């Protein structure tokens, strides 16, 4: 750790959590291993308040070059904060640690599929609106997500949705052993991603919400999705989805990227639909 560039060490200071400010429960994993090496933790802020956090150990990092790049990803992610985006609490320099807020209700796809929880049509639309708000913030920062889906959004104790699976919170479902159906047509064809391809994925996430987590295109092979979309076939209107909201979903899947709504338009339209409930 003495081998690190001093100006870079000075630059990461506002992101670094001192070792005496973090208690990691290395004996308690979060999410039964499905989310990788992520543990319960307690972060102590400047006032001494105990913060329940999720602590990811980064085993893929060994060399100083990899450590330096990790410090930089911490610096940039720390500048992203919004009520509907998963915030970085900090990093701890054993392997490097990523400290994230604890999300009591786990991923949004499992939450809505959960037979115990009974979200209403209003609640599901409200979750979609929160995702559109988080994406509107990311798109305003010129950030392209590339993997937007309900499985990649977390839900906290106040039922606030947080867009996740970006920055140091990426590779969240990478488990140790002993997304073409959300992709825009141009991304399937050219492998290039834009905010307009995130809008297409958002439309698929909205369909996931309104079907309470049904898998999209269950009878279509991932290879055949491209031709299926070029034929002009699309995900159908879910049973209790209001017509104006499905019109918004369909606009997200327009084959011409420039014809799709912006996330600002999506927040606008969905907020007005949500307000009817
Ligand atoms: O059944 C569950 N109860 C809580 C929970 C979580 C949970 C809790 N807190 C969290 N904080 C940040 C994340 C996402 C994340 C996880 C691993 C790596 C990178 C990012 C996260 C996920 C996942 N499943 C379940």
From Swiss-Prot:
Job description of the protein: Receptor tyrosine kinase that transduces signals from the extracellular matrix into the cytoplasm by binding to hepatocyte growth factor/HGF ligand. Regulates many physiological processes including proliferation, scattering, morphogenesis and survival. Ligand binding at the cell surface induces autophosphorylation of MET on its intracellular domain that provides docking sites for downstream signaling molecules. Following activation by ligand, interacts with the PI3-kinase subunit PIK3R1, PLCG1, SRC, GRB2, STAT3 or the adapter GAB1. (Microbial infection) Acts as a receptor for Listeria monocytogenes internalin InlB, mediating entry of the pathogen into cells.
Post-translational modification: Dephosphorylated by PTPN1 and PTPN2. Ubiquitinated. Ubiquitination by CBL regulates MET endocytosis, resulting in decreasing plasma membrane receptor abundance, and in endosomal degradation and/or recycling of internalized receptors.
Modified residues (Phosphothreonine): 222
Gene: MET
Record region (Interaction with RANBP9): 155-277
The protein's name: Hepatocyte growth factor receptor
Effect listed in the UniProt record for changing residue 138 to V: In RCCP; somatic mutation
First and last residues shown, out of full length: 1055 to 1344 of 1390
Compartments (UniProt record): Membrane
């Amino acid at each position: 750790l003495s081998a690190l560039n001093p100006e870079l060490v000075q630059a990461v200071q506002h992101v670094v959590i001192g070792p005496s400010s973090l208690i990691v429960h290395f004996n308690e994993v979060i999410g039964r291993g499905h989310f990788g090496c992520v543990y319960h933790g307690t972060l102590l802020d400047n006032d001494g308040k105990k913060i329940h956090c999720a602590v990811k150990s980064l085993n893929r990092i060994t060399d100083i070059g990899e450590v330096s790049q990790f410090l930089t990803e911490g610096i940039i992610m720390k500048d992203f904060s919004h009520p509907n985006v998963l915030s970085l609490l900090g990093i701890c320099l054993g392997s490097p640690l990523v400290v994230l807020p604890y999300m009591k209700h786990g991923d949004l796809r499992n939450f809505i599929r959960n037979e115990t929880h009974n979200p209403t049509v209003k609640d599901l639309i409200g979750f979609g609106l929160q995702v559109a708000k988080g994406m509107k913030y990311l798109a305003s920062k010129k950030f392209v997500h590339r993997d937007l889906a309900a499985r990649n959004c977390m839900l906290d104790e106040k039922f606030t949705v947080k867009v996740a699976d970006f920055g140091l919170a990426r590779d969240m479902y990478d488990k140790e052993y002993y997304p073409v159906k959300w992709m825009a047509l141009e991304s399937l064809q050219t492998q290039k991603f834009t905010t307009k391809s995130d809008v297409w994925s958002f439309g698929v996430l909205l369909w996931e919400l309104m079907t309470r987590g049904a898998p999209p295109y269950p009878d279509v092979n991932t290879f055949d999705i491209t031709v299926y979309l070029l034929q002009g076939r699309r995900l159908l209107q879910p049973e209790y989805c209001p017509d104006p909201l499905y019109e918004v979903m369909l606009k997200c899947w327009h084959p011409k990227a420039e014809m799709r709504p912006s996330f600002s338009e999506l927040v606008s339209r969905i907020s007005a639909i949500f307000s009817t409930f």
